[PDB]
Amino acid sequence: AIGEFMVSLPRMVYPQPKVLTPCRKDVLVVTPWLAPIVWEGTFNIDILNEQFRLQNTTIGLTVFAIKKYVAFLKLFLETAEKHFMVGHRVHYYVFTDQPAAVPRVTLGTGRQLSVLEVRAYKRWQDVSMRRMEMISDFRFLSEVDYLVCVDVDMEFRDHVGVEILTPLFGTLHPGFYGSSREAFTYERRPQSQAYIPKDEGDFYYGGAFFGGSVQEVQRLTRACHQAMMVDQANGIEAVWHDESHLNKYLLRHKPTKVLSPEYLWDQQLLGWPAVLRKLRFTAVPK
Amino acid sequence: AIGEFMVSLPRMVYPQPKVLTPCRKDVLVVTPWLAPIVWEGTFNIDILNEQFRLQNTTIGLTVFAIKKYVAFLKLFLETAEKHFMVGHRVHYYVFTDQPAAVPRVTLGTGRQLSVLEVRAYKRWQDVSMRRMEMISDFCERRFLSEVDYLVCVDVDMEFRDHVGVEILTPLFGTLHPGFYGSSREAFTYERRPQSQAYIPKDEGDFYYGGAFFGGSVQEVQRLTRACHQAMMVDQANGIEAVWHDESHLNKYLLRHKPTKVLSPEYLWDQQLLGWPAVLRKLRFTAVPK
Ligand SMILES: O=c1[nH]c(=O)n([C@@H]2O[C@H](COP(=O)(O)OP(=O)(O)O)[C@@H](O)[C@H]2O)cc1-c1ccccc1
Ligand SMILES: O=c1[nH]c(=O)n([C@@H]2O[C@H](COP(=O)(O)OP(=O)(O)O)[C@@H](O)[C@H]2O)cc1-c1ccccc1
Ligand SMILES: CCCCCCCCO[C@@H]1O[C@H](CO)[C@H](O)[C@H](O)[C@H]1O[C@@H]1O[C@@H](C)[C@@H](O)[C@@H](O)[C@@H]1O
Ligand SMILES: CCCCCCCCO[C@@H]1O[C@H](CO)[C@H](O)[C@H](O)[C@H]1O[C@@H]1O[C@@H](C)[C@@H](O)[C@@H](O)[C@@H]1O
Ligand SMILES: [Mn+2]
Ligand SMILES: [Mn+2]
């Protein structure tokens, strides 16, 4: 459940946080609306695990594996088992047009998988974009506390845990975390619902990893889908599809945490910069 | 109200946050449980003002002015009018044994004051400690219906710069000005295991000041009730914590991590501690007494 109040922790022994000696001096670790930006070295996972275990938190993870992308499921699920929310209750929701093609993956205790059969759109943009509709229409409200929504063409390489959980989060796109807002590939046509002008924008968030409480994720995905439908009626398709709309949404509804690109990376394209102490969730070659 | 969901903001023009060039590199700006530590430069007050105005946020500010401490009210209130939550709904709650002694102070629109008549304890320790009981009692009697957040402070203070909605969150504490740079073994926690407020030398995140804490009404109700109950247990065991209510506040916040922590910009004594470079603003400061 998501607790209504602060929980009470047991005695714990860990290093004292030092007010005058911050660990991360190389990156921004809080947004101007006072949401934390999650990097290695900013959190004590022992404290956070206690907080979330005491609420018996259940996390849902949605992933789409339509047409040839079913091939990515084996590695995605096997690595999630090693690295995603270990110790907490996890419900995987695998959306696919080929239920029989879902690999049998052995799950740890307290983890479950549901296979949701869905339509395969012809245009890859429509598959990517129509995730918003499918997530928004999809039982989660009675089953999980948080939803995490990710691409399938990925693997976990390192810890991704309850440090990310919060009412609404987006993830810094790995291609643009160091870029100025004028360079962001936001939709720039005022005719699109995803329009963001050159003098606005905080971050460029990646469409491949967002989430929050079930209620907030439902609102986000419903709003993105609606905006896409308006665009479609107006004869326009945003430059980066679902991601463009995600960015418009998070511009106007500020996320309560932002994840660093540790959580969404492509080592082939981008290497392993000093600023990334861990590479947690990374692109698989395709 | 406290809105159930994220609010939708209008178009705003402001400097872009830069991921690779943080403004504050000199201080910790987030706790290990991912609560912001609020320092000048960490927040854009225009964004926060929008978020909180859109929810028509009402902030209650409690202050005790028992016996001779009514003398502090005029400066406290006049300065609060200049600096505290300006632009938002505010409700001051003055707990006093002398209602007729509360100074007439002209208030801005959307701001009001209630005088709460309470008993005066003989021992200064009890006056300080019984604030927890009194706040908790009034949470049920008044605060839950009247305000969204409560901010609970000492009266022997004045506002000297902005104190606003950047502090609002479910539960917050404030880094005590005497110890923000100290190691946990130098914190003056209650060190006697017999006390409910006991914290051993190998525990503790911060030393929080008893003079400035707050949160949602429901969290403040829980904190103040818990602290009073701990103090009653101590009393029945014939023990009184070294720093009274502050000792219990520290025990409470160790075990119930605050969702924001305020830097000592929000609780300072300039005569005693000067003005270190790390403090770019002095917002709420001790009055000589
Ligand atoms: O045929 C698909 N089936 C499918 O299930 N997807 C889902 O959409 C996500 C986004 O598409 P990606 O190819 O991973 O997009 P990028 O990461 O921007 O390259 C995939 O991870 C996957 O979960 C995506 C595709 C697809 C196939 C070809 C081109 C674009 C998208
Ligand atoms: O006579 C009092 N009346 C009163 O209302 N108070 C309230 O308790 C608060 C804390 O006591 P302080 O004297 O400010 O304590 P310190 O900040 O530790 O000096 C005061 O701000 C005030 O709000 C405190 C006192 C008091 C009087 C003498 C000694 C200690 C406390
Ligand atoms: C420094 C600026 C110039 C260099 C920018 C380098 C990263 C570009 O990234 C693409 O960015 C697009 C938006 O502009 C979309 O999000 C696209 O899905 C993404 O590529 C996806 O994610 C990438 C990380 C790769 O995994 C790529 O194969 C994917 O197709
Ligand atoms: C570096 C360590 C050694 C030096 C520590 C210097 C500050 C000490 O501070 C006192 O600390 C106590 C707890 O240990 C209580 O909170 C007390 O109320 C407080 O004094 C109150 O607040 C102070 C800021 C002053 O305003 C003082 O006049 C007050 O009585
Ligand atoms: Mn992808
Ligand atoms: Mn005082």
Numbering used by the authors:
A (entry chain B): 58 to 195, 199 to 346
B (entry chain A): 58 to 346
Copy text verbatim from the article accompanying this structure deposition.
In the AAGlyB-2 and AAGlyB-2-HAA complexes where the 5-substituent of the donor analogue is a phenyl group, the electron density is well defined throughout most of the only chain in the AAGlyB-2 structure and chain A and B in the AAGlyB-2-HAA structure. Also, the lack of electron density of the C terminus cannot be explained by poor data resolution because AAGlyB-2-HAA diffracted to 1.7 Å whereas AAGlyB-1-HAA diffracted to only 1.9 Å. Therefore, the reason for the destabilization of the C terminus and of the internal loop in chain B in the presence of 2 is likely the lack of hydrogen bonding to Val-351, of the type observed for the formylthienyl substituent in 1. Finally, as for the AAGlyB-1 structure, the AAGlyB-2 shows well defined density for the galactose in the tucked under conformation, whereas in the AAGlyB-2-HAA structure the galactose is not visible except for a few blobs extending out from the nucleotide β-phosphate. This suggests that, although our enzyme kinetics results show a lower turnover number for compound 2 compared with compound 1, and although the C terminus seems to be incapable of folding over the active site, the enzyme is still slowly hydrolyzing the donor derivative when soaked into the crystal. Our results suggest that this pseudo-closed conformation allows the transfer of the sugar, albeit at a slower rate than the native, closed conformation, and could therefore be the reason for the small, residual turnover observed for AAGlyB toward 1.
One important example is the biosynthesis of human ABO blood group antigens, which is the most important blood group system in transfusion and transplantation. GTA catalyzes the transfer of GalNAc from UDP-GalNAc to the H antigen acceptor (HAA) (α-l-Fuc-(1→2)-β-d-Gal-O-R, where R is glycolipid or glycoprotein) to form the A antigen, whereas GTB catalyzes the transfer of Gal from UDP-Gal to the HAA to form the B antigen. Each letter corresponds to one critical residue in increasing order such that the AAGlyB chimer would correspond to GTA-L266G/G268A.
